Amino acid sequence: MISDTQIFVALILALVSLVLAIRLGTALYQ
Amino acid sequence: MDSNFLKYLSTAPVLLTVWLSFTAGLVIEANRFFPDMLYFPM
Amino acid sequence: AGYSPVPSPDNTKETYWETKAPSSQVLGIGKDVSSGNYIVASVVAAVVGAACTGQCIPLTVSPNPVFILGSFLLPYSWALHVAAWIQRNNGK
Amino acid sequence: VKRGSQVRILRKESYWYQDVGTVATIDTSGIRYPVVVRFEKVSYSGVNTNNFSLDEVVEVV
Amino acid sequence: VAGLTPCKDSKDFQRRLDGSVKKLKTRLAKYEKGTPPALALEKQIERTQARFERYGKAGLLCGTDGLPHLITDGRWSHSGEFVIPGLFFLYIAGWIGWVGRSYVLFARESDKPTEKEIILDVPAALSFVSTGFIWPVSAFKEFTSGNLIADESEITVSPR
Amino acid sequence: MTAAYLPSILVPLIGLIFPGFVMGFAFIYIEQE
Amino acid sequence: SHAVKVYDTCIGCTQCVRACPCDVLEMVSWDGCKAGQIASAPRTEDCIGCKRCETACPTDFLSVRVYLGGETTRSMGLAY
Amino acid sequence: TKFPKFSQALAQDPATRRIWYGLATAHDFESHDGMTEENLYQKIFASHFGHLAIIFLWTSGNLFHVAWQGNFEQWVLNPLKVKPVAHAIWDPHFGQPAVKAFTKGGVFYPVNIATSGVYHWWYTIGMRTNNDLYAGSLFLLFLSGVFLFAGWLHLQPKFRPGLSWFKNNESRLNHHLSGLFGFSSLAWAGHLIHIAIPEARGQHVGWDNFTKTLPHPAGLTPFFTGNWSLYADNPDTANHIFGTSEGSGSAILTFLGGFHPQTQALWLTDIAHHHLAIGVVFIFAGHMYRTNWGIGHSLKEILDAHRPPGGRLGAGHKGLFETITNSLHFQLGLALASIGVITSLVAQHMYALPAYAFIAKDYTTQAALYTHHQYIAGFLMVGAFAHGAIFFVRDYDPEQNKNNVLARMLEHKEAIISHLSWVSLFLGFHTLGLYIHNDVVVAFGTPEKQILVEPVFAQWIQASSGKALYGFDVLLSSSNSVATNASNNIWLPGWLDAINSGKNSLFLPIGPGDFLVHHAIALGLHTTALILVKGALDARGSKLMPDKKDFGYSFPCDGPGRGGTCDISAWDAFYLSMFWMLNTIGWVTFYWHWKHVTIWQGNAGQFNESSTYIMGWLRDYLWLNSSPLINGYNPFGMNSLAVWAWMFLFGHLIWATGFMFLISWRGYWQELIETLAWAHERTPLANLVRWKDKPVALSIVQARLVGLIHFTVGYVFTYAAFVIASTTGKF
Amino acid sequence: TLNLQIPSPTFEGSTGGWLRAAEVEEKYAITWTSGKEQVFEMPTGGAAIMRKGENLLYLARKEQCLALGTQLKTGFKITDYKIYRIFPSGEVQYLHPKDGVFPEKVNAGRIGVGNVSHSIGKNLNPSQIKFTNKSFN
Ligand code: CLA
Ligand code: CLA
Ligand code: CLA
Ligand code: CLA
Ligand code: CLA
Ligand code: CLA
Ligand SMILES: CC1=CCCC(C)(C)[C@H]1/C=C/C(C)=C/C=C/C(C)=C/C=C/C=C(C)/C=C/C=C(C)/C=C/C1=C(C)CCCC1(C)C
Ligand SMILES: CC1=CCCC(C)(C)[C@H]1/C=C/C(C)=C/C=C/C(C)=C/C=C/C=C(C)/C=C/C=C(C)/C=C/C1=C(C)CCCC1(C)C
């Protein structure tokens, strides 16, 4: 019932969150 | 009796063993003559 | 000793007391109220709160808002009588 | 506090804090901790004697 | 009666008695009459029956499991279950503690307290043991005279 | 290319490649002057 | 390395110096005790932290204290 | 090296201790090199943002997997018969038998059956389709991104908060009580009224429909007219099929009390009213403290003013304002203790009063949730006490706390610890003695000689709440009581129906076994508290080490000097309290699981009779219920419980491994590793390779921690496997 | 100074001797004069025979060197043992009898390091030395 397009949108949001997580990790590491 | 032997009997482990054996005998005889006392009879 | 100073709200006074009664700054907006005023307020609040509570003890499906509001005077009367004491022993 | 006198210890780090000992000697030379106090109770390290200052000992009645 | 039924009129209690007696009788059936095993098993049966009868008459309450339950709330109808036994304990325990403390002080004021504590002075120990029978009034007398509680400034304490 | 292939495509990654690369990089970082 | 410190409760008994498996403690001159000597810790970089000095100390709580700090080869006693 | 960038003392270590301690001290910011208070607070703020993002991502992953590989849509049809599947299994190690054994839930691929209850939770909320779950997961991914961005932003130079802002107690308290708690619960009530209840009555309400769909036929006129009772008229009938319009009502707010008949859970209207009421209460509570305007209180003023004139508390609460505001460990301890109490309450109340539809009949889910939350509660309580001890070591200022309540606690710590030890010994001696007495008499075949004490106090409390099973006739069991007459026409009918039916876990009947296990729990709580309180109070010093605060919180020891000083730290007090906390929660969860298993199979007499001696627990609970689990796989085949059997043995293994670190200590291993290093250096063809960090044995504190972690993992995994597998194999 | 030509106590060899860390970081040495040929115990393990005259020995740890020195001082009556530390550069250093006299007896010239002017009870609190450069002394 969950389509591949839906899963791809979820993956894109996950990638955005990963980029933001890397940014936060760097800022905290400083 | 030798005073040294009496002191040896007065030593802590001997007295503890004798006293606790006496207490165990007291409890055992109490349970032998008045057994199964789960309550104070009233 | 290197801790930053602790921020407190504006107009924060010293309320610590080892006297017989607090300094009447503990009562805030009611610091200038009279001890007799507090006594009468406490008695009236106790009576009204008890009456409004009794009017609602067998709570129905449609309780009266005014009785609900007035029932909150019984707890209020306690504070009022405590204040009366404080204000009586602070000189007023 | 004199020699052969009962003194209660007032040093907080001491094993004998608020405990009584007997003064064995008081050295008037001018050292930091002149008085010497002997105790019946042994400490954890096994020593029953110590050196105290005059402000860390109070005579008992 | 509190929340349960009297044990004297409980089918569960009767069933438990019957089961115990039947187990003993089955064990007895394989032994010749008058032999030590038969006599021992018959005495066991008699003891079981006496125990169950005494429990029934004691007024004990029994639950659905068929076993007596104790009501240790303060009810005077069930004092014999916890309170009076508890009073007997407290008496004996206070006796023991009072005499032990007395002997500790006695040995403290001796030439060699440690020697008196490892090798006892049993005459004085028996003296204190005898004294222990009025320990409640003696202990309260000590407390009021101030010989029991030590002052805060005379007890060693660690630094904060 | 359906979503049913994603488990087979990813589990080996997340379970062998990501741990291997993370371990190698962390090793290089911790042992580094 | 570990931080070894000496306090005025020192009586100059020297047992702390004699108990040290390394050579970290030495006796120096002083006027605050009858013996006229006080312990000092000049070679604290060789300390291993065994606290033998602490064990061989007769004053009510120790006049010599070892505070275990950063670990080095000598502190860890690594012959390799 | 530059691994522990926050500690040169570790960066300069030539051994593996550098790596280990850099791992274990990464989050102790206060101890880091050149750490200022502002940097500390700002880093904590950003770390909180990251933690919230992690939580959102975790819940989003749950929702996404249930939407993608789940059977939610076919579970909402027959929730009492369909098993909820958590996620699909793709393990290249499975054989065909394993794939077939795990292919369940009505799906056609191996799956895991959820034990978290998320299915019931979401169904109750109003989720019906997989698209709803997918949208929720998308929103939670977006929220995680937003919070990560917020954390990054608030580390920027022009956005980093100041300490005058971090220490602003009144504004934070007002906002957390009013908005975070109050308005949040008000919004939950709004959700329950606009979506959950219509969805439970078969009317779909969503973003495309909620602006045109009235939650109540009267609209908001009853609210804005003062005729609020119109929102309670016409509740759902007793024959309401949850999720359908058959038997539904129109009420949105009520106080029926008790449980919905079909779902066997609390009324959704009751939940909505609960949340609305607590929301307005919290909004009122959030207006207490002073802010940029003149109204309100000041916590400093209140604390300083509260000193009983009798002087039995000394200076009262003077200085506590500064102490708490300047000590993050004091705040951490308070928060951890409160959250631990609340999660225990969550566990205790959520099994007695289920709130989700059909959750009560998911036996494995209920046991899993209860065990989960009790273990979390115990962890949180241990942490609260550990951080109280850390506060005493690090942040305590005696001159500031001159003769206030805290200083008085430290003053009579000896009395506190001695009385706690006495009560612990009291409880232990007598509870264990009664258990052994019962064991011996039952063993000799005289169970009638057991000491079985009826928990008359707890039974009296139950009767007061309205349980007629025991004959007490106190407050609500009494039909002529003022308590009964006051609530007879609001909630008492439904509440009595719920309490006096044996179909639920609400106020389960109790007996002497419950009495004994309760006193065992009391012993456990008191002994864990003893260890933790002693650690906290002796953290600053003792007669053995009267200068412990100089050495800190988690130093290894003070040497064999004064007769031996092993485990002389507050950290070591925590380390032992963690064994005791694992023991107490084990007792609690054993009691819960056995009682509920016996009730579920209907043989409550088994518990009532065997709970009175320890052989009963060992035989009729562990030995009896371990059969399906240990048969998960056997020489004759395997089933889905094979994973739980494997995890059972895994827990046993890691537990026994932790025993290694806890019993064997450092010197032996350091003298063994020396020989190993010699061998490597003198082995040809392997001396070509050389370690860059000198291989050393584990430190004393490190070994204690590692053994504790292994012990805890074994504990938790073993009991998780046992509980879930036994429940799933029995029902 | 250290003379690297002093003979050694005719040891038979062992696996407890120094390792690559001795060649890379630090290698300690001990020299002592013996009146006769006795048998002593190596701090690393095993027996060795000391020579009549001067004996030089190499070890990996100052603790091993000082344990050997203590054995010589107590078991035997040799107290002229000197300890050195050698780096790969060859920069021999002199350590044990630093001032020519053992530390157990006071000697004029030493400067007190690590001495504090109060008892341990007068140490400050970590709360008082928090977020500051003060020392707990
Ligand atoms: C969680 C992640 C994970 C994954 C995805 C796999 C996957 C696999 N394991 Mg398992 N394994 C894991 C964890 C995992 N393992 C762990 C934690 C352990 C330790 C207990 C093991 C221990 C283990 C053993 C002992 C064995 C496997 C085997 C297998 C294989 C399944 C059976 C088969 O017929 O393949 C086999 C058929 C093949 C054609 C194998 C092709 C594999 C290619 C070459 C992989 C590519 C490697 C890649 C280039 C390395 C990159 C390195 C980089 C990260 C630095 C498969 C490759 C079996 C096997 O045959 O492994 C080789 C096997 O004997 N595993
Ligand atoms: C939200 C609450 C909270 C917060 C903010 C903190 C914050 C802090 N705690 Mg902690 N603490 C908490 C809860 C909290 N704690 C709880 C609940 C407990 C009780 C268990 C403790 C007990 C505790 C102690 C006893 C100590 C701290 C310490 C600290 C400080 C240093 C943290 C550190 O060293 O990280 C540690 C870094 C880690 C990476 C942790 C590694 C170990 C964890 C537990 C993982 C083990 C599980 C394993 C990986 C799972 C395997 C799975 C299996 C299937 C294979 C820091 C201020 C230390 C400190 O500085 O004290 C002064 C300290 O000594 N805390
Ligand atoms: C056959 C049954 C039985 C058995 C085998 C025991 C065995 C024990 N009881 Mg006892 N106990 C029993 C029945 C039994 N009890 C009953 C029925 C009650 C209810 C009244 C108690 C109430 C009780 C208490 C209140 C205490 C014990 C304690 C103990 C233990 C130590 C006793 C001791 O050292 O005495 C030797 C005596 C001393 C060392 C002197 C000091 C202690 C005693 C008990 C003081 C008595 C007088 C004092 C004024 C009482 C104040 C009580 C109040 C604070 C509640 C011991 C394992 C003690 C314990 O567990 O301590 C950790 C303890 O304090 N028991
Ligand atoms: C934190 C929540 C979470 C968890 C525990 C899991 C767990 C799992 N996912 Mg993943 N997954 C998640 C969120 C999560 N997912 C989300 C939000 C999505 C939508 C984008 C997906 C999409 C997804 C797919 C499409 C697949 C999995 C699969 C899996 C399984 C193997 C791991 C894998 O391939 O990951 C791969 C994951 C990704 C490529 C993207 C999601 C990565 C998340 C967001 C990382 C979150 C990290 C966390 C917040 C913090 C880490 C803490 C740190 C201490 C390690 C495993 C059951 C595979 C499988 O075999 O399932 C049966 C599979 O095919 N997941
Ligand atoms: C209305 C305004 C507002 C709001 C909404 C928040 C919200 C928040 N602030 Mg706060 N904050 C505010 C004003 C506000 N703040 C102000 C004015 C200041 C400056 C004076 C601060 C200063 C501040 C700081 C310094 C910090 C926060 C933090 C937080 C977060 C706390 C952690 C959390 O999410 O707990 C969630 C808690 C709840 C949802 C409610 C309480 C939970 C209890 C247990 C009830 C449980 C409910 C229910 C039964 C659970 C079941 C649900 C389901 C599973 C069935 C949270 C997002 C912390 C953070 O994480 O920052 C990122 C933090 O460090 N705030
Ligand atoms: C089953 C194992 C076990 C037992 C019996 C105990 C017992 C105890 N622990 Mg615990 N403890 C355990 C495991 C256990 N611990 C483990 C694994 C750890 C982790 C290291 C700890 C860590 C720990 C700490 C840190 C502390 C305790 C404390 C206690 C006491 C709690 C109060 C109590 O129950 O008193 C009742 C006493 C008992 C249940 C034991 C009595 C045993 C028998 C029945 C007595 C009769 C003896 C008999 C006559 C001897 C005959 C034999 C002879 C001929 C040789 C008590 C001494 C606390 C304490 O000391 O409080 C005072 C405390 O601070 N424990
Ligand atoms: C799907 C699709 C559609 C068409 C185009 C496109 C090429 C994009 C194509 C491909 C997309 C691809 C390959 C997407 C890949 C998805 C990926 C890599 C998803 C992974 C997401 C991972 C996430 C969140 C991780 C979150 C981790 C967090 C918070 C960690 C927290 C933290 C920790 C643990 C330590 C301290 C720092 C911090 C940040 C607080
Ligand atoms: C309201 C109601 C309903 C039904 C009838 C009933 C009579 C029950 C009635 C009353 C209920 C009441 C009064 C309930 C009482 C519950 C209470 C008081 C719960 C409190 C639990 C306390 C806990 C965990 C305390 C934990 C303390 C900790 C970590 C302390 C740590 C600390 C240490 C060690 C050093 C200093 C710093 C710090 C953080 C403070």
Side-chain angles (χ1 to χ4, degrees), chain A residues 10-11 14, chain F residues 6-7 10-11 14, chain H residues 54 57-58 61 64-65 68-69 87-88:
Chain A
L11 284 166
Chain F
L6 285 177
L10 296 178
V11 174
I14 307 306
Chain H
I54 280 163
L57 281 162
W58 157 74
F64 173 83
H65 278 267
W68 177 30
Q69 301 150 351
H87 57 89

Side-chain angles (χ1 to χ4, degrees), chain D residues 8 12 15-19 41, chain E residues 152-159:
Chain D
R8 170 160 290 114
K12 281 151 184 176
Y15 182 90
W16 299 282
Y17 178 50
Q18 285 173 335
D19 293 348
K41 261 174 29 171
Chain E
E152 165 162 19
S153 55
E154 280 125 41
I155 311 159
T156 191
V157 289
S158 59

